[PDB]
Design a protein that fits this description.
heterohexamer; A mainly beta; B alpha/beta; C mainly beta; A: mainly beta; 6-stranded antiparallel sheet; B: alpha/beta; Rossmann fold; 22 helices; elongated; binds the ligand CC(C)C[C@H]1c2[nH]c3cc(OC4CCCC4)ccc3c2C[C@H]2C(=O)N[C@@H](CCC(=O)OC(C)(C)C)C(=O)N21; binds a molecule of 2 linked components (NAG-NAG); transmembrane (chains B, D); ABC-type xenobiotic transporter activity (chains B, D); glycoprotein (chains B, D); identical protein binding (chains B, D); nucleotide-binding (chains B, D)
Chain lengths: 118, 566, 107, 566, 118, 107
């Protein structure tokens, strides 16, 4: 219901990328699915994957082995861990919320920009 | 030993009329056409027919035949009842263990076998397999020498051979009968019945009993059979087989014409003046179950291509199912794939248990011969073959399917759910195999019982719960769902696997389901099919499969106990 | 997967004018289509759910009338506050794909 | 007519070495043990073996054997190839229609049959059925007289009989050979091969060719065979069959010892001084397809218990399915019951099409004998048996299932949906039957092809769309769904039936579905399975079943065309 | 959304019973299911059956062959036809509305009383 | 079918008091339970849907907390306008059955 990304805004190539979305106003272990969306320069949205309310996860097949989403139910956080990063995915990363019964990405984050350079 | 039979009127239709004659120690033969009495008099003289039809008396040395007669005389089947997957040493040890007494030492019994196997001339093939379809074995001329030795273990005084030359070649059949003539000089009264012998065979006999259409047409010495029909009004040309000459007279070069000639003979009155001179278990249960289960296990090892081939199919199909259903998802397709793999696994255990028809059907003529001869009971033959064939061959695919597919598919990752699935697949394999034995026991063809198993399965599999919803069937059909083995196995696997499951991602529906008609948790699927959610709703299905094992293995026992053994 | 095509990648309209945005799918979506509006510098915002319904907090000038594979968005009598980029998402199949986006302009 | 063969070296292993001799018009016989040349020389003299192994020449009256030899000489099989469900009049009319020319009037051909059936003595059984398992018929002594008459229609000058007495009784076998001796006085050279004859048989011969292990051991007059072996160093006792005496010498009362005695004879040099005196389609295609299809239809009527029994099973199972699934509801259980009855109907049409294995397997020895004899082509035998057996027996259950269950269940009440379902069940019955013929054509056992059909069906039936969702399979397995017949039939029945359907009562979900994960209309079910909603998504499934009929009936044609006919 | 029953308030035994519910404010061929509920004297509610928005129908099995529900889409009416009437079902008949996605009988009629006497 | 049992067929309470109504089913309903309130002389009125949710137009004194086969209704601090007859309906299986009803009273 109120989402907020945070993380390093720059990263060396082929190491790892870590983000964090802290949810306030709702419990992430209660109802919805919690997902990550990136928007490239030359704007095209691209879905990455979600973690469920019960810990199950599902990722985009174009990000094979490189993405993993974990959570920390003690303080309502879920994490993006994108590893071996190329300089092509210098996108804007969002955390969003999926209703399930409605089917649409209802709530969105503010959006943080990640630049992959050297 | 002298047999002496008198005035036999056997009936089912009186296909024997009145047959007289004694059988002195020598080499006695019973000739004639096929439909006559050459096969029926031999089963009367060896007590292999029902005494409800028997009329006259059969006497031995002035004493009637006791109940110990079937154990003290050897009867040899026409076709070989030897175990072709055991060796010649092992087949004689099985016959020695269940017919000789338990007092005798194993050192004493092995010398009795060495006396037999040296007398028959089986020294070069004493440790060779007799032979099957899949095994190169000992030739058919020494399968017949083996089966004579399985009846000479108790040293009988009277041997009964049933067609000792039918099925053998011409050079082979002289080697069997020259063996028998050496046996006849030891004092063993040999009584057999040959289909159309040759003069090299006919020159060896000591007595002849010619029968056609249930009428005695000659009985006396076999040398005087030619001179009898010359003096009856017939003539034998040169270079003619006299045994071919005798059945030529039967067919008309009449039966009531030629049977009355024998009554007016000097051979009938000499026989009639002899019959009035004379007239006027062993083994414990645990020892029978030890040796029936031992031979039935060597057969299971000595035939790998019907035992290894069911393990190869289990591993290959277990990997094909694990690849198609590789790790299951908790999404909209997740109910369909779990209900479809668990339906395939229970109806595979049913249709692959049609090979249990072959258990009591192939061994039928060997069960009937060895029961009359007095080796074992029906109870120790039944339990000793369930213990050795049915028990280990139905445990192994139920373990191999569950070990392969459980962690490829990603079923419920608990330790007790792993073993309930292994135990549920194992009870549905026994219950379908017991049903196959309850139909096939007593029958002698495979193809009718194999079809009747398949018809009953496809009606049990409509009532299993995937094709039709069992809560929607009309009340006058819905009692038929209690008679179906795949219903109880597929209810117990669905109960095991669908309990703590969610299937709508992003929707917590286990506290409340917003917007019904959804099926978002595994309890909603499971109640909608009609499955109880209590822990008795799981184990109700196992006490109903255990009660069908006990019923179907009692029907299978009573069909062997009440069988026509004669 | 299912790819979503917005072949009119730009427009050029004026105020009070009716504009129509089309979205084409490579599979049957069965009205599982959503529309998003992204102002420059903000997250996308949900506009239409289920290809016909409209969200509380938007005027009754937007409407979606689609069926099958052809879905469309109609902005009748657009204001100044309606210029932006419009995306179409499917949420039928499991890798949720968006459209390419179409950027309205003012002549 | 005189055969005169010279120096034959047949090879596959040279199991014939060098055999010489002429065969004058009379009653010629080929004796010896079984593994020798008694069965191989007869197939060389009648051109029933492959000429790639043949070495020497076979000459008739100074002229070599043409390609017209198989049509102008009659060969008679050992076991009866007569149609047991037709009568003795009808079996000779089929042989007269396809071997005699089309110039002859039906008045001319029926007199030729009346000359044959009067000569054989079949007047009392001229209009009786020959006999099957289910029909009491003419006895086995006159099935052999019938099959001789099927080869005497064209009046051949040379008859070749293959074991004319094996399988008959002793009184029967004299009645067949006394018929042949009357034929031999008409001028027909009769050449046969008897397994172990009798002196009543041996006294009738006119020549004898004794063979053992591919070596010529006697050839000459059959009367002089006894005096030859007396002068070789052997002695025949009194009352011995001379034909039993000859094979007694073969077995050792050696082969290279006794074959060299024949080279130094007065019989070999007289034969050698004779061979150097001499040396030094018919019918149109439409007439063959008329009579193959006519006899194959009388067989289908004359065997009711395999044709009526499949109509009784169709009606009874059509009423059991109609009672369990009696009128379907548009509720939460409505998707399950429609997808389960349509899955049962397509996989019943597949498994009940395993009886098509029996079509080309039971008739194999009659196809091979009649093709070499030159009745029909492979093309008119193939098309004439698809037209008569496969075509009407696979239309009828597809009509009876659809007429019974469609209005009991209450499927889509339109007229075009009724006939698409009837046509979809009919294409899946042909495609599964063509696959059964593509495997069984050429083989001679049923049980291996029956198992291989069943293994292929249970893999086609996982990939059909009920057990596993076909959109979830990995991309390296998902191409295997194109090789499955129940996928195309079950997609076309689901497309036909789930179109205008609603399944959530009280919820109009065809304009918009509130609260997804619901499946409230039949298009949502059908896209979720992966089925196209266009009208090509229906008829894609029928052009894929029609292309599998053409492929599988071409593989079944090339397996009969490229068969080993020899 | 606004339902109103009307019909004869008395009926002879073993003839037929006819009611009519005219719906205003909503189209009966548009969305919901439209059903009949009766309440006996000695109050116990009892569901009788519905007609769907698309003409399909479903009845209570205790009223076997005796109930039929028809509609008239020209003026938004649906009809109750209860035949061969006993003097035991002298209840109060209601017409109601079933949401489908919510699952509950949301809107109700005013209720008309039928007495079966002679 | 599924029969629904309200064994407390009556009560006797006072104002401001908490009363609890129980409903027992003969089968698993899986939260497909509704509660109805019938004033004397009126049609029944929906109170709770889905065994926990409450309808717009009712105070937050009513609550349903049920699971499995045991479902219950709690009226905490009842007013004068809360006396009536309370029914429980299942809408899981297809012949929708009601409970016997329970008639609150005022001491
Ligand atoms: C093991 C499997 C490939 C053959 C097995 C078998 N599974 C079935 C499962 C079925 O569920 C259907 C799936 C969708 C709904 C129902 C239906 C039928 C079958 C059959 C046929 C059965 C059979 O006719 N014969 C035995 C033994 C054959 C055998 O021993 O195989 C070798 C190669 C000789 C070693 C058998 O094992 N099957
Ligand atoms: C007609 C039916 C009773 C027998 C038929 C048949 N259907 C099947 C359907 C199957 O789908 C499964 C059902 C649930 C999902 C998948 C699986 C197997 C089968 C079989 C067996 C098959 C067979 O073994 N061969 C002929 C035998 C006909 C016959 O000769 O029997 C009579 C009584 C003498 C006429 C056959 O038709 N069946
Ligand atoms: C789904 O929602 C339910 C509520 O409807 C959650 O279950 C309750 O959670 C609260 C808070 O932890 C507990 O106090 C209750 O005891 C829980 N009730 C039950 C019946 O378990 C549940 O946690 C949610 N699902 C998941 C996976 O978290
Ligand atoms: C279900 O609701 C839909 C609304 O989306 C109805 O369909 C429309 O009905 C209006 C009113 O007559 C028509 O003008 C439209 O043309 C209809 N649209 C379509 C695509 O057909 C529909 O009638 C309702 N269902 C039923 C069975 O009546």
């Amino acid at each position: 219901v109120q989402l907020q990304e945070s993380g390093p805004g720059l990263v060396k190539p082929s190491q790892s990328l870590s983000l964090t979305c802290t949810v306030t106003g709702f419990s992430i272990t209660s109802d919805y699915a919690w997902n990550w969306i990136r928007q490239f320069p030359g704007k095209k949205l691209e879905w990455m994957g979600y973690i469920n309310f019960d810990g199950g996860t599902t990722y985009n097949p174009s990000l094979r082995g490189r993405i993993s989403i974990t959570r920390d139910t003690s303080k309502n956080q879920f994490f993006l861990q994108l590893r071996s990063v190329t300089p092509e995915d210098t996108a804007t990363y969002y955390c969003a919320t999926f209703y399930g019964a409605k089917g649409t990405l209802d709530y969105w984050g503010q959006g943080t920009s990640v630049t992959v350079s050297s | 030993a002298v047999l002496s039979f008198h005035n036999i009127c056997y009936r089912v239709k009186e296909i024997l009329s009145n047959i007289n004659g004694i059988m002195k120690p020598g080499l006695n033969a019973i000739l004639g056409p096929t439909g006559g009495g050459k096969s029926s008099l031999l089963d009367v003289l060896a007590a292999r027919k029902d005494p409800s039809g028997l009329s006259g008396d059969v006497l031995i040395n002035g004493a009637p035949r006791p109940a110990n007669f079937k154990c003290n005389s050897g009867y040899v089947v026409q076709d070989d009842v030897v175990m072709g997957t055991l060796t010649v040493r092992e087949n004689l040890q099985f016959s020695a263990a269940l017919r000789l007494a338990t007092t005798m030492t194993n050192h004493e019994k092995n010398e009795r076998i060495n006396r037999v196997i040296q007398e028959l001339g089986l020294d070069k093939v004493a440790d060779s397999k007799v032979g099957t379809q899949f095994i190169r074995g000992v030739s058919g001329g020494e399968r017949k020498r083996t089966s004579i030795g399985m009846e000479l273990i108790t040293d009988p005084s009277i041997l009964f051979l049933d067609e000792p030359t039918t099925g053998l070649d011409s050079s082979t059949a002289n080697a069997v009968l020259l063996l028998l003539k050496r046996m006849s000089k030891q004092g063993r009264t040999i009584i057999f019945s040959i289909h159309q012998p040759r003069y090299s065979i006919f020159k060896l006999f000591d007595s002849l009993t010619l029968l056609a259409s249930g009428r005695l047409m000659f009985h006396g010495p076999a040398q005087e059979a030619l001179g009898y029909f010359e003096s009856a009004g017939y003539h034998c040309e040169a270079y003619n087989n006299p045994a071919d000459f005798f059945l030529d007279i039967i067919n008309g070069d009449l039966i009531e014409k030629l049977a009355e000639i024998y009554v007016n003979s000097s051979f009938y009155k000499e026989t009639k003046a002899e019959l009035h001179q004379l007239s006027g278990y062993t083994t414990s249960f645990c020892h029978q179950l030890r040796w029936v289960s031992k031979r039935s296990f060597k057969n299971l090892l000595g035939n790998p291509q019907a035992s290894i081939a069911q393990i190869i199919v289990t591993v290959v199909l277990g990997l094909v199912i694990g690849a198609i259903y590789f790790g299951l998802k908790n999404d909209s397709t997740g109910i369909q794939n779990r209900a479809g793999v668990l339906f395939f696994l229970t109806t595979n255990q049913c249709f692959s248990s049609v090979s249990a028809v072959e258990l009591f059907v192939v061994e039928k003529k060997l069960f009937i011969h060895e029961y009359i001869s007095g080796y074992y009971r029906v109870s120790s033959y039944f339990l000793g073959k369930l213990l050795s064939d049915l028990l280990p061959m139905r445990m192994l695919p139920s373990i191999i399917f569950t070990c392969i597919v459980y962690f490829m598919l990603g079923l419920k990752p608990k330790a007790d759910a792993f073993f309930v699935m292994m135990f549920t697949l194992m009870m549905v394999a026994y219950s379908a195999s017991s049903m196959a034995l309850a139909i096939a026991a007593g029958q002698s063809v495979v193809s009718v019982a194999t079809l009747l198993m398949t018809i009953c399965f496809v009606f049990m599999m409509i009532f299993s719960g995937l094709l039709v919803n069992l809560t929607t069937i009309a009340s006058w059909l819905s009692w038929l769902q209690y008679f179906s083995i795949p219903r109880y196995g597929f209810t117990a696997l669905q109960h095991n696997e669908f309990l703590g499951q969610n299937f709508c991602p992003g929707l917590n529906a286990t506290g409340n389901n917003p917007c019904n008609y959804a099926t978002c948790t595994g309890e909603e699927y499971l109640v909608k099919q009609g499955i109880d959610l209590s822990p008795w709703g799981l184990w109700k299905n196992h006490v109903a499969l255990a009660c069908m094992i006990v019923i179907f293995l009692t029907i299978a026992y009573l069909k062997l106990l009440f069988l026509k053994k004669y | 997967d299912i790819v979503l095509t917005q072949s009119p990648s730009s427009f050029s309209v004026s105020l009070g004018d009716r504009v129509t945005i089309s979205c084409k799918a490579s599979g049957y979506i069965l009205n599982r289509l959503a529309w998003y509006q992204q102002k420059p510098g903000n997250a996308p915002r949900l506009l239409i759910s289920g290809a016909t319904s409209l969200e509380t907090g938007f005027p009754s000038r937007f409407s979606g009338t689609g069926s099958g594979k052809d879905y469309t968005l109609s902005i009748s009598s657009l204001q100044t506050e309606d210029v932006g980029t419009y995306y179409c998402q499917q949420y039928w199949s499991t890798p949720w794909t968006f459209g390419g986006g179409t950027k309205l302009e003012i002549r």
